[PDB]
RNA sequence: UCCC
């Protein structure tokens, strides 16, 4: 399918299904590269207290509940592992993810 | 323990899991915290992946690894602190900067 | 119909 950055996908991890936030750059996403790097998203809002983590409301993400991006949990998944494209994270919130991403990875 | 950035470990990477070298790219503050997990980039012996943009070739002389290796910037894994015990060595500041630009490139940072 |  068409996978691009800043988009939220329901990923298959009986696999344990979880929403993920693609953080890999779009040129690699469009390539023949088999895998996609993403951040694991939880509905546990308590994790938004962690420094790098950002909060995502359900109203913008089309997720069934208010969720939190866990920038400390980074997974590299096959493109085939991604399922539903539920929504896209707006620029303002993705920028907060990028800042938190730089703190965790010292970038 | 005191797992630091730019350091290389042996890890049982889950796909039979694979025993591969990994380069710790998680910052030292988070490494020092009570966070149970550490983020790292997979190191490969397949030196053909060096041609890939963000990837950085690792000379065997500098990494204390058995053979010439390449850090796979597109291969990022989250591991527990307790699973990073087999320590090899640390990637010098000169090569780690190339890993920085590669990580910014792949992750669009 | 989708969180020690």
Q: Where are the domains of chain B?
A: 1-109
Cβ atoms < 10 Å from Cβ of B102: 20
From A72, A6, A29, select the one nearest B38 (Cα to Cα).
A72
Q: What residues contact A66, with CB distance under 8 A and at least 6 apart? A: A43, A45, A55, A56, A57, A58
Q: Is B27 on the interface with A (CB under 8 A)?
A: yes
Q: Is A80 on the interface with B (CB under 8 A)?
A: no
Sort strands A17-22 and A54-56 into parallel, antiparallel or unpaired.
unpaired
**Helix ranges (DSSP H) in chain B:** 28-32, 60-63, 93-106
List the strands of the sheet with A82-88, edge to edge: A54-56, A67-78, A35-42, A17-22, A7-12, A82-88
Cβ atoms < 10 Å from Cβ of A52: 20
Of A5, A98, A104, the CB nearest to B39: A104
Cα separation, A50 vs A15, in Å, equals: 27
Helix count and strand count (H, E) for chain B: 3, 6
From A76, A102, A100, select the one nearest A22 (Cα to Cα).
A76
CB < 7 A to strand C: residues 9-68, chain A: 10, 16-18, 42-44, 46, 64
- Which helix H or strand E contains A96, and what residues bound it? helix A91-104
Q: What residues contact B64, with CB distance under 8 A and at least 6 apart? A: B8, B88, B89
Q: What residues contact B91, with CB distance under 8 A and at least 6 apart? A: B6, B7, B8, B23, B58, B62, B63, B71, B99
Q: At the topology level of CATH, where does B1-109 sit?
A: SH3 type barrels. (2.30.30)
Pick the CATH number of A1-107 from 3.40.190.10, 2.30.30.110, 3.40.605.10, 3.30.360.30: 2.30.30.110
Q: How far is the CA of B58 from the C1' of C4 (A)?
A: 39
Straight-line distance from the first to the last Cα atom of chain B, in angstroms, rounded to the nearest whole number: 29
Indicate yes or no: strand C within 7 A of the C-beta of A86.
yes
- Which helix H or strand E contains A101, and what residues bound it? helix A91-104
C-alpha distances (whole Å) from A88 to each of A7, A41, B9, B56 are 4, 13, 36, 31
Q: What token pair was written down for B65?
A: 């690894």
Q: What token pair was written down for A87?
A: 């929504």
Cα separation, B92 vs B62, in Å, equals: 8
Cα separation, A20 vs B42, in Å, equals: 20
Q: Under a CB-based contact definition with an 8 Å cutoff, are residues B11 and B83 in contact? A: yes
**Technique used:** X-ray
Share in percent of chain A as helix, strand, coil (round to 5): 30, 40, 30
């Amino acid at each position: 399918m068409v996978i691009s950055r800043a988009e939220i996908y329901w990923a298959d991890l009986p696999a344990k299904r979880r929403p993920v936030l693609v953080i890999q750059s779009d040129p690699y996403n469009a390539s023949r590269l088999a895998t996609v790097i993403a951040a694991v998203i939880t509905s546990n809002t308590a994790l938004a207290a962690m420094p790098g983590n950002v909060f995502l409301p359900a109203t913008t993400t089309r997720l069934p509940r208010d969720s939190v991006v866990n920038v400390t949990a980074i997974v590299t998944l096959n493109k085939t592992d991604l399922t539903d494209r539920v929504g896209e994270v707006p620029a303002s919130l993705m920028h907060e993810v990028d800042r938190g991403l730089r703190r965790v990875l010292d970038l």
